[PDB]
Design an enzyme around this catalytic site. Sequence first.
Site, PDB file in Angstrom:
ATOM      1  N   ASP A  79       0.876  -1.270   3.608  1.00 42.72           N
ATOM      2  CA  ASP A  79       0.367  -0.024   3.040  1.00 42.72           C
ATOM      3  C   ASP A  79      -0.610   0.652   4.001  1.00 42.72           C
ATOM      4  O   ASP A  79      -1.797   0.302   4.058  1.00 42.72           O
ATOM      5  CB  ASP A  79      -0.285  -0.303   1.690  1.00 42.72           C
ATOM      6  CG  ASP A  79      -0.667   0.967   0.949  1.00 42.72           C
ATOM      7  OD1 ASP A  79      -0.526   2.070   1.524  1.00 42.72           O
ATOM      8  OD2 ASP A  79      -1.100   0.869  -0.218  1.00 42.72           O
ATOM      9  N   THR A  80      -0.114   1.674   4.708  1.00 39.93           N
ATOM     10  CA  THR A  80      -0.944   2.423   5.640  1.00 39.93           C
ATOM     11  C   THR A  80      -2.010   3.248   4.928  1.00 39.93           C
ATOM     12  O   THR A  80      -2.993   3.643   5.561  1.00 39.93           O
ATOM     13  CB  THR A  80      -0.060   3.324   6.501  1.00 39.93           C
ATOM     14  OG1 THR A  80       0.768   4.139   5.658  1.00 39.93           O
ATOM     15  CG2 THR A  80       0.839   2.498   7.434  1.00 39.93           C
ATOM     16  N   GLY A  81      -1.848   3.508   3.632  1.00 42.38           N
ATOM     17  CA  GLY A  81      -2.836   4.270   2.896  1.00 42.38           C
ATOM     18  C   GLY A  81      -3.979   3.451   2.343  1.00 42.38           C
ATOM     19  O   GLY A  81      -4.883   4.012   1.724  1.00 42.38           O
TER      20      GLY A  81
HETATM   21  C1  LIG Z   1       3.497  -0.997  -9.499  1.00 47.70           C
HETATM   22  C2  LIG Z   1       3.294  -1.085 -11.010  1.00 47.70           C
HETATM   23  O1  LIG Z   1       2.061  -0.472 -11.376  1.00 47.70           O
HETATM   24  P1  LIG Z   1       1.864   1.170 -11.215  1.00 47.70           P
HETATM   25  O2  LIG Z   1       3.065   1.908 -11.636  1.00 47.70           O
HETATM   26  C3  LIG Z   1       1.473   1.647  -9.405  1.00 47.70           C
HETATM   27  O3  LIG Z   1       1.184   0.421  -8.787  1.00 47.70           O
HETATM   28  C4  LIG Z   1       0.687   0.692  -7.466  1.00 47.70           C
HETATM   29  C5  LIG Z   1       1.677   0.830  -6.316  1.00 47.70           C
HETATM   30  C6  LIG Z   1       1.138   1.139  -4.898  1.00 47.70           C
HETATM   31  C7  LIG Z   1      -0.381   1.298  -4.678  1.00 47.70           C
HETATM   32  C8  LIG Z   1      -0.932   1.609  -3.248  1.00 47.70           C
HETATM   33  C9  LIG Z   1      -1.451   3.053  -3.340  1.00 47.70           C
HETATM   34  N1  LIG Z   1      -0.321   3.881  -3.735  1.00 47.70           N
HETATM   35  C10 LIG Z   1      -0.388   4.944  -4.751  1.00 47.70           C
HETATM   36  O4  LIG Z   1      -1.351   5.190  -5.377  1.00 47.70           O
HETATM   37  O5  LIG Z   1       0.864   5.665  -4.939  1.00 47.70           O
HETATM   38  C11 LIG Z   1       1.078   6.407  -6.187  1.00 47.70           C
HETATM   39  C12 LIG Z   1       1.757   7.723  -5.675  1.00 47.70           C
HETATM   40  O6  LIG Z   1       2.997   7.261  -5.321  1.00 47.70           O
HETATM   41  C13 LIG Z   1       3.356   6.320  -6.412  1.00 47.70           C
HETATM   42  O7  LIG Z   1       4.022   5.080  -5.917  1.00 47.70           O
HETATM   43  C14 LIG Z   1       3.075   4.060  -5.970  1.00 47.70           C
HETATM   44  C15 LIG Z   1       1.915   4.509  -6.912  1.00 47.70           C
HETATM   45  C16 LIG Z   1       1.986   5.865  -6.990  1.00 47.70           C
HETATM   46  C17 LIG Z   1      -1.906   3.556  -1.987  1.00 47.70           C
HETATM   47  O8  LIG Z   1      -0.921   3.337  -1.015  1.00 47.70           O
HETATM   48  C18 LIG Z   1      -3.166   2.789  -1.533  1.00 47.70           C
HETATM   49  N2  LIG Z   1      -4.336   3.350  -2.301  1.00 47.70           N
HETATM   50  C19 LIG Z   1      -5.307   4.186  -1.558  1.00 47.70           C
HETATM   51  C20 LIG Z   1      -4.855   5.727  -1.627  1.00 47.70           C
HETATM   52  C21 LIG Z   1      -4.827   6.230  -3.150  1.00 47.70           C
HETATM   53  C22 LIG Z   1      -4.291   7.690  -3.176  1.00 47.70           C
HETATM   54  C23 LIG Z   1      -5.850   6.557  -0.775  1.00 47.70           C
HETATM   55  C24 LIG Z   1      -7.213   6.755  -1.555  1.00 47.70           C
HETATM   56  S1  LIG Z   1      -4.966   2.266  -3.476  1.00 47.70           S
HETATM   57  O9  LIG Z   1      -3.968   1.309  -3.975  1.00 47.70           O
HETATM   58  O10 LIG Z   1      -5.468   2.933  -4.680  1.00 47.70           O
HETATM   59  C25 LIG Z   1      -6.254   1.328  -2.559  1.00 47.70           C
HETATM   60  C26 LIG Z   1      -7.707   1.836  -2.512  1.00 47.70           C
HETATM   61  C27 LIG Z   1      -8.744   1.005  -1.719  1.00 47.70           C
HETATM   62  C28 LIG Z   1      -8.293  -0.305  -1.006  1.00 47.70           C
HETATM   63  C29 LIG Z   1      -9.340  -1.104  -0.207  1.00 47.70           C
HETATM   64  O11 LIG Z   1      -9.618  -0.270   0.900  1.00 47.70           O
HETATM   65  C30 LIG Z   1      -6.841  -0.788  -1.041  1.00 47.70           C
HETATM   66  C31 LIG Z   1      -5.802   0.047  -1.836  1.00 47.70           C
HETATM   67  C32 LIG Z   1      -1.375   1.178  -5.864  1.00 47.70           C
HETATM   68  C33 LIG Z   1      -0.848   0.872  -7.276  1.00 47.70           C
HETATM   69  O12 LIG Z   1       0.553   1.615 -12.048  1.00 47.70           O
HETATM   70  C34 LIG Z   1       0.253   0.930 -13.214  1.00 47.70           C
HETATM   71  C35 LIG Z   1       0.064   2.001 -14.247  1.00 47.70           C
END
Ligand SMILES: CCOP(=O)(COc1ccc(C[C@H](NC(=O)O[C@H]2CO[C@H]3OCC[C@H]32)[C@H](O)CN(CC(CC)CC)S(=O)(=O)c2ccc(CO)cc2)cc1)OCC
Lengths: 99, 99
Positions: free
Chosen positions: B25-27
């Site tokens: 996860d690059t994000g």
């Molecule tokens: C899977 C079943 O559960 P689920 O459906 C979703 O599960 C998930 C699947 C993938 C992710 C990863 C997350 N991706 C995400 O938000 O993508 C959204 C939009 O695209 C959709 O696809 C996937 C979700 C939807 C992102 O890459 C990384 N994030 C940061 C970014 C946030 C914008 C930048 C601030 S972070 O995780 O918050 C995070 C913050 C701080 C730290 C330490 O530094 C580490 C990680 C998270 C939950 O939710 C339950 C209701």
Amino acid sequence: PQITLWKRPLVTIKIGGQLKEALLDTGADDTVLEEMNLPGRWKPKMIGGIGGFIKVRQYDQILIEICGHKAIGTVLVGPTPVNIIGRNLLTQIGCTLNF
Amino acid sequence: PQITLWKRPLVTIKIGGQLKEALLDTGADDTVLEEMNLPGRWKPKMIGGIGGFIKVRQYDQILIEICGHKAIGTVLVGPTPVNIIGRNLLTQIGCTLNF
Ligand SMILES: CCOP(=O)(COc1ccc(C[C@H](NC(=O)O[C@H]2CO[C@H]3OCC[C@H]32)[C@H](O)CN(CC(CC)CC)S(=O)(=O)c2ccc(CO)cc2)cc1)OCC
């Protein structure tokens, strides 16, 4: 280009004629942008992240240029903490992970 | 190798003597793993994304093997819905974005 990950992979995007900064986010299925006016129809959707779900406006077949590469696809607009480019558009610009 | 983004970039990792599946996860600045009872000291932390914040346990200098590539750094453990490998470890295995 080849983008290292010592820093956040932020790039300039162009959407609705406006330039913005967005995060290339391989952990995001979908592309989610902060609140903004976009022309065209939209339908409300829900998306879930680390902290739970939010309400977004779904715009389909929206043109968006990412670091010089054109994409046309789905863009969600809503209270995301950061503009994120997800896999639905990263695939369109030919983006891969490599190590 | 090279990982396309048609599907979620899920890989096998090895941590605490256990094998798990995790998203490259690059994000994500840092690595967040599903609840696990890792030994040693930790510090409380709150991390935010879409939907708000969750409470996590920050462990330092944790070894993780990712597709045969070893990395050692900070690992956050908490009620995340997915194991997330963030940039703090992706840099150590030579991972780049390319388009
Ligand atoms: C899977 C079943 O559960 P689920 O459906 C979703 O599960 C998930 C699947 C993938 C992710 C990863 C997350 N991706 C995400 O938000 O993508 C959204 C939009 O695209 C959709 O696809 C996937 C979700 C939807 C992102 O890459 C990384 N994030 C940061 C970014 C946030 C914008 C930048 C601030 S972070 O995780 O918050 C995070 C913050 C701080 C730290 C330490 O530094 C580490 C990680 C998270 C939950 O939710 C339950 C209701």
